[PDB]
Design a protein around this ligand. Structure first.
Ligand SMILES: [Cl-]
Ligand SMILES: [Cl-]
Ligand SMILES: [Cl-]
Ligand SMILES: [Cl-]
Ligand SMILES: [Cl-]
Ligand SMILES: [Cl-]
Lengths: 340, 340, 340, 340, 340, 340
């Protein structure tokens, strides 16, 4: 957990994040060309960052956003496939792990159902060791089929990694779920468009703190014909302090070293802000002093979560009374999104 | 949702938060004296803030922190009781609602079990309309018996209010639970000691954003013999932007107007960052375009929450493997907190 | 007055501002090509911002700065003309209002007098509803003929709009004049070059506060052969708080919703910082309590403004004694600007 | 214009500003006691700041705010009087100039009309050389009789000084008026209560920039029974950059050196942001190049100011249509302030 | 190197720094009373910070600043003496190390030569293990006899500590000297008065970075009759990032954990910003590639340092030509400081 | 020392710094093409900045970084040579001084020893008046032969200038050496890659403060195939306050005026923070009051500097025990950098 150098040691994972300029592409050949540019960039960066162990690219960095449905279908990737092979070679050549974005990944029922929005973690042997499908797509504008599982993967030097995508990060639950599965680094890849710049910068930090986890964010930059992406890729410590943060500049890079031993020393020995421990041992001091044993309380005291787990339709109905009952709103209509 | 004036209108609730100087008290008579000082302060403030509809005092602002167990028991309050009556009179006199702290509130089995750490919302008729007992006490150092329920109360001008205390706020779940019950303002009262200053400033903002809720934070200030409290009381909009924020100064005050109609207009019509709606309608655009109906997906896709709800002991066991198995740590022992 | 979403509601005007990359152009055909790029950008943005009701482009965004006098004359536009028609079509197609820059607009005596520097507000039917000529050109370097009038126009959803340009904004008087005519949003379009970056960021906010008005700023970016433009396009509330702000990035975009009902509720009911009201009712409490009626004092107590209005030549003479008597200075000469 | 040292030179005026803790006083004897504390503080500070040439205390620093009308009348000062004599002795003893606050100063018709809120500049010989009565009292809450004139006084080392008070500063006109009379430093003394902290910090800087003037702000701190004052006393350069700024701390001090020769060199030779010059020579480059002489345009092109000067009642009527027609509002009533 | 918790582990030293309110004292009995208050504060803090291993108090925190020469002499301490015994007991009782300030410490020729300004490091057995005399007193105002040596002491958990005082920190040389002797933490104790607040905040961070060292700063707060002290006590990592920072508040506290293993892992394995290594192996890559061996260059290439070491009088003469030749200046005279 | 305008006066040097986009070049013809682009940019900028007296370009701005050794040798420049002639013409044409980068400059033994990394100061007559070779190259990655001397040159309007390059700036010694030779402005030209962005922004400011010198920093921007450069070119006052600062944007420009008379007035008359004076007159007040004459102490009390000057090999050995003994580390190996 330290910032400023280009090295990495047996104790630290050198993480690089990339403010990748958002492509505006249309064909499979253009996607492949751009995959190769990413691969070239990984290899170049390694030559400047000898400590680099993990390189992180934004959501949509390979295809851009395929606004046109037909082009979306025609360019949706297989995984493994030609794109991931192009990425795998660069990971082997540069002896790094990497996180890359396939938007879309073909649905099992392609081309008759929406593609997934997907991330892969590829190791320094070029092997895909985690494939994560975005659980909370950025509706209404974006049309990806929602995934349903988070994953934790042993990463470089043993650092436990989970991947999440863009809009997922707005939802504290996902960051909780990954940390509770053991994640030591949550990697958030995004093509996060203006407007919500300060809010997204703040959310990553707050999640790092709340879940006692390293966080790495790679966000796209530039204007792509529709949206302007605000960069601010960053790596953040498990104590909520930024290591390094990019600005809005195209193809900015940040790089930081995250200590394996520091996060484990902290999860073991921290007390007042050992949030993962504390949430499931509530009021331990009190129960000890009241003669009720020394574990505190584990029971979930939040009816929202009880209800969502036992009766998701009721949780939904509940929320619709607070918000609205249709996915669309007649005051701001959007074609193909129903309202009224 | 606007900042700078001392007025309030039919549409806005004028919220004042107080950087109350932490008392260092020892006897019931001193507590009562200090309750009266708070009451005097409410009445004075009203004369300078004619728009004031809600006044918020920090956790521990009435008793301070009763470090000595015997004094803790001797000073624990009934609710209703003499303290709340003193507060109620000031709310009637100043025609404001108020949030006040009783630390401790007598346990049902007092003096044989730890007191609760409690907040009350008192209306402008002097009536207690919400009593909230802290669900996640600041263990290990503090010994309060944990509460188990959140509440939503119709407040001034119809604004829906939930109360939470200090350490609760580190845990996104609580802020979710209150908003999912309908809360429009989550009031976080704290006696939040250094060190974790920037982290707590950031957490309130991030929670306001993540839960599309107004947030008001009153935090104590000064040194009390043990801890130094860092102030930064604040009121924050539902879009994650601070309205006004205090510094670390003793008896700082901030004041902002929060629009009833703006938060409801937003919860109804916002789309990309209507987080409460979106969490229970995941991938709606995708499912529409894939021929699967127009509601998106409501189902909880996070195994942590499923497991915590169905088998809290397993969730606990899981977390102990990531952290530690005893509430204490031999590397930093604390008397009465077991370890090894 | 809220920030973060892409929607807009019956109550809010969705304003987008653009950090448009400064062109370096030379011919009428190149200007027309670039007008079409702007139009294309409006249509694209709308597809990502369904709430968008108003889109704002920087001063010089259409022609760039025509440094060469002959090219300046050859490219000066008529209004209405081919450029505005190109803009009008994009406003109709995207069902938005827009603010566009013509630099120059032909003088009535073209080509024998300097062109104006001009902005137009075009409605969602493609009709020009306000044409504003810059009153305080950025002398000495820039050569535009000064305009002489501010305007207030009923805009989208009834929001009252005034336009101002760049250097105008340094002068509090202009922002006062527009607000005193009824303006609810003052739109400041600029091609504001380094050096004065922080000063210009601060000025917009301070003016929003001082005049209880929404403010939207679109500023150019990039290097154009002569000047580097620093972006920081922004939308600011009437309480002086930024909604959203760009960085220095080329073709950044920000987007915010400004509430019609909030600004009117505020101008009606605010008291301590109802600056527009207060300036013309000075010392009301005092005069009431002194038995002098209940209106306060309206009379202008500032001799500078009395003198400027009655005897502008004397105001000028006065200022020349404090500054200098010639437009140029021999310590930093500039060709065609006299000094000594 | 430089910050960091305790010295001052023949070229620089050493200005100290004081975050004076707001008194809560009630009697003439208590006011005199507190005047003596201020005097003692001036003498002490000088021993630590040998460069100090000007010391600035907040509005209300001598009496506090006399909330009770009878006490307000009983404590209103003569000028010259016993308070100013107490101040004058400290200025002579410490060989400094000073700015002190008398709230109230007796009306000419005392006790039958409201006192003024007044500042004095006292030279290093103990002579009162400027007495300024607040032109825009902080209505509705505060009841001072409004003054009607600004002043410019030759100060230490020849530095031209104008004084303004608190709420005046929200109004750009006043800062313009003083600079247009020749002011090189505008001293703003305030007892500026929360809420509007960031807005007031920003306003001073923006005014320094807009009027090419040094600015010094002394603001009170602490809680006085009614209001909490937020400090942030500061000295700001004529280029809009803060020299030094206090926090919210009681009896903070800042100190900076302001160069006589730098501000005069700037007012003489600055060009693009010589705002005082530019406002009365608009479009000079354009008129030169259009064959219309080399002075630009001086004429006031702002109808608000024309109307306010010629027909203040009409300006008032105009503003009442945009805001409200009565000084009070029924949605937030205040006793003795009429509404409906 | 992590921030937020109250614990500490076998790997981390828990450092607390105190924004101690500056005393205004006059007699030996008052000094002893205040020493006891400090001791009481150490013991109290420990009860809230169980991880605390090192507690740091500001320069002047024991005596305040003895402005009066006679009182300065009458209150100058022996070390060891009654004050240090009072401190030692609190370190033993709270099982912490501590850094305390004696201003003055008796000169060897007391009372005929100025006292030193001195710091002591006292271990958790109450033993004085380092006594540092300020090398660069804050002339002209302060009169302490200059010390001449820096020290490095094995501290808690083996962490290597050097002490420096206030004005020393403005001079990069001192921080270099301590790090080059092996220091892992440089503790800077100060009673650092306004004006130079931002400059001092920045200097500590920059020194932490430049010397790859932990830094802890304890600075006084409050007004003492002469000076106002600006707090901002802090602990900073060896990568130049703040762990935690106080504001200007009286008796603020910050607390952070500094990893023994992280700083040693970094000094061993960092490459591009291993400044201590790099300064004495300049151009290693170049010399390797030019066939000149693999150590780079160690030789001092800075004539200032060569000259200062070999001929300090010449270095002095040199500097006097750039600045002035007498310690005082006639433009800002100070009694007992000669000029002209 | 003032910021915001485009003018300059007899008293001020107008300094422009350029966030030059990092080239990716390979041949001598491409280098010459890019030299011409720089020249064109100087001439253009002058037309927008009539006050400009000094223009500053980043390290590597002419050649980019020649990663390939053969291309490095083939493109290394003579000085004077064709590149400098191209620069000299633009300085004459635009009547400015300039600082330009030649990376590499041919070694005396070219092509058999590594080129230098070099800067030149070229006057407004096109004459090279200072040539500085980087003393501390950015090892390990970069291979330049280390230089050994700093220089001070009379610059525009008599302003004394020293040049330093990139990595040099991390080392306080260099900034000391230049100021102690008389430098009034230290110009730091860098191609400073991410990661260490905030650290480098802070270092320049801290050095400006510590050495009572103006500082100008020009840093490259963009991605060059290997590294992403973070801009933040800036000009900083001798009191440690930024005048103006760029962001990360390609071809950003900042411009500020630095007063000749202000820095000399300050070095003459400042007292508490006259660091250059104070370092060689330590404890003057104390020695005066102790009867030991009125010069304070000049002697170097820092053993590191004594040892480095007398026995550089011992200083080296000392540092290797604190860091490591080989230039490389086996935990992060780099080809051609030995370790173990
Ligand atoms: Cl999505
Ligand atoms: Cl608790
Ligand atoms: Cl212009
Ligand atoms: Cl007032
Ligand atoms: Cl000292
Ligand atoms: Cl280098």
């Amino acid at each position: 957990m330290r910032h400023g150098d280009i090295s990495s040691s047996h104790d630290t994972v050198g993480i690089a994040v990339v403010n990748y300029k958002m492509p505006r592409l249309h064909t499979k050949a253009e996607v492949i060309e751009n995959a190769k540019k990413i691969a070239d960039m990984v290899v170049g960066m390694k030559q400047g960052l000898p400590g680099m162990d993990l390189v992180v690219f934004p959501e949509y960095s390979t295809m851009g956003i395929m606004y046109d449905q037909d082009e979306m279908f025609a360019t949706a990737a297989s995984i493994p496939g030609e794109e991931t092979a192009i990425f795998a070679e660069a990971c082997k050549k540069a002896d790094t792990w990497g996180v890359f974005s396939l938007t879309g990944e073909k649905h099992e029922d392609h081309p008759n159902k929406a593609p997934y929005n997907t991330l892969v973690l590829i190791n320094n042997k070029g092997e895909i060791v985690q494939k994560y499908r975005k659980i909370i797509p950025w509706c209404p504008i974006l049309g990806w089929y929602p995934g349903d599982t988070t994953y934790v993967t042993e990463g470089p030097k043993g650092l436990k990694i989970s991947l999440i995508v863009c809009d997922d990060g707005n939802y504290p639950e996902i960051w909780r779920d990954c940390a509770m599965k053991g994640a030591e680094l949550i990697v958030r890849c995004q093509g996060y468009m203006y407007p919500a710049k300060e809010q997204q910068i703040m959310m990553a930090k707050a999640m790092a703190w709340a879940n006692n986890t390293y966080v790495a964010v790679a966000n796209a930059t530039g204007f792509d014909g529709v949206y302007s992406y605000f960069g601010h890729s960053a790596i953040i410590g498990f104590d909520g302090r930024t290591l390094g943060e990019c600005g809005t500049e195209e193809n900015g890079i940040q790089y930081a070293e995250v200590s394996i031993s520091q996060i484990r020393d902290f999860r073991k020995n921290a007390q007042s802000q050992n949030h993962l421990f504390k949430l499931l041992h509530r009021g331990y001091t009190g129960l000890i002093n009241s003669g009720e044993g020394d574990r505190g309380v584990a029971e979930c005291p939040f009816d929202f979560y009880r209800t969502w787990v036992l009766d998701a339709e009721k949780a939904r109905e509940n929320v619709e009374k607070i918000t609205r009952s249709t996915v669309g709103t007649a005051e701001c209509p959007i074609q193909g999104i129903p309202n009224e």
